[PDB]
Amino acid sequence: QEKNEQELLELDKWASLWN
């Protein structure tokens, strides 16, 4: 739940770093 939100945040983080 808040775990989804934290996982999401990491996925957004790394997505922003992708080639």
């Epitope: 945040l9 957004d12 983080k13 790394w14 922003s16 770093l17 992708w18 080639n19």
Partner: antibody, heavy 111, light 113 residues
Amino acid sequence: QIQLVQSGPELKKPGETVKISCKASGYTFTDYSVHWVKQVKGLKWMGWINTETGEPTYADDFKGRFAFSLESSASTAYLEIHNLKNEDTATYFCALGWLHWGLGTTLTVSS
Amino acid sequence: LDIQLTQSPSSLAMGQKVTMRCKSSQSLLNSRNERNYLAWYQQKPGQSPKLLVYFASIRESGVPDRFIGSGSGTDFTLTISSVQAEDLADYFCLQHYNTPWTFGGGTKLEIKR
């Protein structure tokens, strides 16, 4: 768990060429862009290299004398500067995007 | 169309609370994921920049919680709740919304007397 190890201090003469390396670990190297930043007294963004295709992208003030390259199998990125100028004197950082900056490589160019 | 960042103040003097600001010439809000593409870094002489806060308001892991980023769109702030001696340093903002990436002019944290 991310580390970016950069090559040591450089002392060069005008006209020469220097090659700076950035060795990455703790992540999939070819998935994320490496950026290069110049710091003299503020910070200047030099451009980025696509770690997937190898394609470099240069900021306006960094077009002709600067080369971004890679050895992907070695998880290493390179900054090569040719025809060195006095004002190339600076600290150069590679960065894993905005997430994590290298320790920096100081370059001094002088006759 | 290079994005401009204006950072203020250029310096402030502290165990009280301090505030520094960054104003963007263009919105840094990504409509798609609703994140703001702005990070805050600390940097001490001879050393490299250290990420404090990313996506405008998310503290990086292990960063002391006395550090607080906030703001959205074109207006952003970094707050240090209670300044410690280890926090004396330069701080700057970075926009990574568009290339070329651009940086604030920095804020230096010194001791008041």
